[PDB]
Design a protein around this nucleic acid. Structure first.
Lengths: 113, 71, 109
RNA sequence: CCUUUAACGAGGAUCCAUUGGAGGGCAAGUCUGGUCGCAGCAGCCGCGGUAAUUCCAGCUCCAAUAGCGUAUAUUAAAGUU
RNA sequence: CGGGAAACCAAAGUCUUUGGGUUCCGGGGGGAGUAUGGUUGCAAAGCUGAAACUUAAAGGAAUUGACGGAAGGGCACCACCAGGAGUGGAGCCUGCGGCUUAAUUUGACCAACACGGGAAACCUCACCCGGCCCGGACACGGACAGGAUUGACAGAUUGAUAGCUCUUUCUCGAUUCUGUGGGUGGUGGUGCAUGGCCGUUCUUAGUUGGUGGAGCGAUUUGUCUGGUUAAUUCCGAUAACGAACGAGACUCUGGCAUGCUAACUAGUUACGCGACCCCCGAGCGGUCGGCGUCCCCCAACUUCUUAGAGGGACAAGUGGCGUUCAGCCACCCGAGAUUGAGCAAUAACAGGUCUGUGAUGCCCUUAGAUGUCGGGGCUGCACGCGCGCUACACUGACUGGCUCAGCGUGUGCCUACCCUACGCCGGCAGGCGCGGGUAACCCGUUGAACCCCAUUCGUGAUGGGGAUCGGGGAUUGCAAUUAUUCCCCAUGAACGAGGAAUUCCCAGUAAGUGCGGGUCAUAAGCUUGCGUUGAUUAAGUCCCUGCCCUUUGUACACACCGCCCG
């Protein structure tokens, strides 16, 4: 389970993603249940950005002893541009996009055109 | 929910007795065929089947809700 | 008890009612005489012989056997004086058994 | 008796290797059936309350081996005299 | 310095690199300072001092939690103060326990108890009592084309018009039946085998890793003395530095537009008007003015209505106060920095749900079935409790008269069904004839209640209250009995402001009052939303109840609902 969870994790991280999460809730190594979280990167949980910047899936998988619950939650990374799919502002802390220019060399003269 | 308690009868389906078959056509001389009781008169009946010789009751078994003479 | 808590971590319950072995060979009905402590207890058998009864696993703190009342007791295969409790009944169950005429008609509840 | 020598004397089914153990300490089963805090196991820690890797059996595996187990005295371990 | 398990200690240091001199004393926890003999003492006792047997822990230091009728800060109308309205009292509805019963099916005990959409006639339905059916795949064997097999009238039987059974004797034709192996179904069991979902701890401000630092280590620092905020919110301090989740930001909703965009499925205004109406006012009746409706357009416009794009509020300005920082208080402008909701962390619970699930393990049952029709029950009462409804009158009831609204919803859908205007008939429930509505189009300019205006009753268990109960009439349905619902006449009870206790609430809020949606063939005292009328009291505090942070103590860690003594 551990090596499988790691293998899927780095792929969804490599493909592009701020972060990602995996849960496996159910039995293993005896007949009491547990939970196993594998997490890397950023995640959000509150506000309206949850509808845009994450997708979440649930799938049941059977075994000879009961059922195991898989859940995967993955965070979409686009903020510069395109598709445009999810909107350009940042989700949880909404950043101030800041360009820079600053020069002067001015001295008085008249330049006729 | 709990298990069935004992009956003192149950019987399912009757065995629909193992009668000898076709003696309904009688032969005494050839090519003559001596028919007994009348063959069924309905349009939907083929009239190749016999009607019951069931006296004090006269009934087509191909029919199953209709055509019951009794005399 | 009077409500409280921590009494649900563990398997409620109850006796969904139910039914009804006996006696068997060395496995018969007795009545509680006293109510010692520590754990053990006293109980005179219904035949006439006295004996000292002993509690059994599970029934330990899972079922209280107040003083006075019928109770199912196995006899030890070899021992006379000490005997081993089984399977208690209900007071209603005990008066149904009495009405049937299987245990002796001598003790009141 | 031993050694020495005739004549008989090996096809694996018998010219048959057992004694303990397989949860940890400690080398080897989260196999199958039965039992269900009962019966029993357990130097010690602990196993059994109907899904027992520890009980009762089967199969397999591990250790030592013509030896192995158990009880008791006693030494080493004990810089715990 | 060095040592120590650590607390600590210039000695408890100079110790596996062990030796300056010397005395006393210790060997797991109990038994026991007991037994016994000796000795001393007037007495009380002192000194000297065992074993049998029993047990795998007893004990020390330190760390993290929880707990404290410990200390210091902070916070909440599920806490209090100040108050408002009630509940508990009475009658009735409904849920729960107990009792009864052939069955009165069942889950759930702050975080159950008008909850399981659970207002059950049948159905539903899991329960109880009768009857029928197989919808037992597939495999192998058997049966077997004078044949495997299928169905049925009548009579009898039967609640039954179930060929269910029997009598009787035709019909169907390899689909089967029968045996064994093996499946399948189950509102069967186990929520302490589980998935998922939900509730709760917890509506508070909490939470974590990296690298470095401090410790033998469990761990700790970062996450803080102080100021400040609703908030781990900021300022600042600084062996930590740079970050993440929650908070905030965000989404929806309310409040501000005579600015912008554009409208016969939305209005207004303007006439053109012609028609009706009364002189009602100047005048005469016309006209001018007033009242609505038809007429309205190739009229004008978008204020009202509708919904889109935008703008506006930021502690912005001023005066105080604060380190003059972060912020706080008052005031101008005005919509004041809080209108109300949605979303919500880490870790946990043996919380709820196998009766939402063709989600699911294991076990059980599976033809005399836990899988279908008929009938009964979940409503049965000497009793106990909870959520509510209606009342105890004159600030009222009763009978007339006047006059105002909003969120929605509606047949063409499930399998037989919608919302209703208008006409006619009836006291009423209702019946009947026609027409519209896919809906800013028709119902509906939703012509609602409280309220408002005028009669009557008179302090009387009264005409207040409408429980109980008799008779009659309608509607739904296959069926209305233990009265489905609705209507008419009659009957006229408790109850005359409520003990011990206790709930909820701070502004269009409480309270009063009606309406729509949900369930629905017929039917809300329930729940969920919406309008209308609209107060009193506070601008606080830690007293009670509870929660957050620090410090402290602990024989607690199944964590005070703990542990433990004779």
């Amino acid at each position: 389970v551990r090596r499988a969870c790691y293998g899927v994790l780095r792929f969804i991280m490599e493909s592009g993603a701020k972060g990602c999460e995996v849960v496996v809730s159910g039995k293993l190594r005896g007949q009491r249940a547990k939970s196993m979280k594998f997490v890397d990167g950023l995640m959000i949980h509150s506000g309206d950005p949850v509808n845009y910047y994450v997708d979440t899936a649930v799938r049941h998988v059977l075994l000879r002893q009961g059922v195991l619950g898989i859940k995967v939650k993955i965070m979409l990374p686009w903020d510069p541009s395109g598709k445009i799919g999810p909107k350009k502002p940042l989700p949880d802390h909404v950043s101030i996009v800041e360009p820079k220019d600053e020069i002067l060399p001015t001295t008085p003269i008249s330049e006729q055109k | 929910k709990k298990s069935y308690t004992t009956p003192k009868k149950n019987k399912h389906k009757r065995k629909k007795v193992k009668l000898a078959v076709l003696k309904y056509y009688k032969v005494d001389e050839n090519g003559k065929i001596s028919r007994l009781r009348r063959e069924c008169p309905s349009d939907e009946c083929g009239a190749g089947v016999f009607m019951a010789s069931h006296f004090d009751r006269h009934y087509c078994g191909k029919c199953c809700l209709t055509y019951c003479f009794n005399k | 008890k009077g409500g409280k808590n921590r009494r649900r971590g563990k398997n409620e319950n109850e006796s969904e009612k139910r039914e009804l072995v006996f006696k068997e060979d060395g496995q018969e009905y007795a009545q509680v005489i006293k109510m010692l402590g520590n754990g053990r207890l006293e109980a005179m058998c219904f035949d006439g012989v006295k004996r000292l009864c002993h509690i059994r696993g599970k029934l330990r703190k899972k079922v209280w056997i107040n003083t006075s009342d019928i109770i199912l007791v196995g006899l030890r295969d070899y021992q006379d004086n000490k005997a081993d409790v089984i399977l208690k009944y209900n007071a209603d169950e005990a008066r149904s058994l009495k009405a049937y005429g299987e245990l002796p008609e001598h003790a009141k509840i």
